[PDB]
Amino acid sequence: HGYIKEPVSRAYMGALEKQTMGWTAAAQKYGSVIDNPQSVEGPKGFPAAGPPDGRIASANGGSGQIDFGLDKQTADHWVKQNIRGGFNTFTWHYTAPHATSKWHYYITKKNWNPNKPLSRDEFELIGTVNHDGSKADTNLTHKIFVPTDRSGYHIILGVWDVADTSNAFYNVIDVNLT
């Protein structure tokens, strides 16, 4: 269990807006993830397997731990944060830092549709961090090159594949790319 804390993952933005908007208003916006940003958990093997299209952002209900609120997708729904093209760092916060196979990072393609459910074919791989099966917390922060050929609203997907389970953690990040 864990989430991407910097940049602020959509899930963690849910936790953060719980403090500012209140439990009811934040939950209306994000669903039940506001209480458990660490539990966006689904089957591993993305992209050939894993959560189906339209269920990527919630990891298909987080294996029962959360609802489908993260799967809404509109140009306007989510809080964007600014990021620059080029090298960026991605820091996970862990509540249970399981033995890990890899992390892998994707960005939406230049022509993606921000008003449709997220699908695999809208993402391209941008970096892969292989791990030796040791606990996640032996490599907390990953240096990933975000494409410089792209601007405006994009989604970065970070995925954490857990070595000792059939699962992975899926954290979309809403970004304004400059």
Domain count, the chain: 1
| Residue-by-residue DSSP string for 68-113 | SGGG---TTTSPPEEE-SEEEEEEEEESS--BEEEEEEEEE-TT--
Residue 112: C-alpha distances to residues 12, 58, 62, 129 (Å): 23, 19, 24, 25
Experimental method: X-ray
> What sign does the CA torsion over 39, 40, 41, 44 have?
negative
Q: How many residues does the chain have?
A: 178
Residue 19: C-alpha distances to residues 10, 27, 95, 103 (Å): 15, 11, 20, 29
**CATH classification of the domain holding 44:** 2.70.50.50
Q: Sort 158 into a burial class: Cβ within 10 Å, 0-12 / 13-18 / 19+.
A: buried
CB-CB contact of 54 with 127 (8 Å): no
Residues pairing with 167 in the sheet? 43
Range of the domain at 156: 1-178
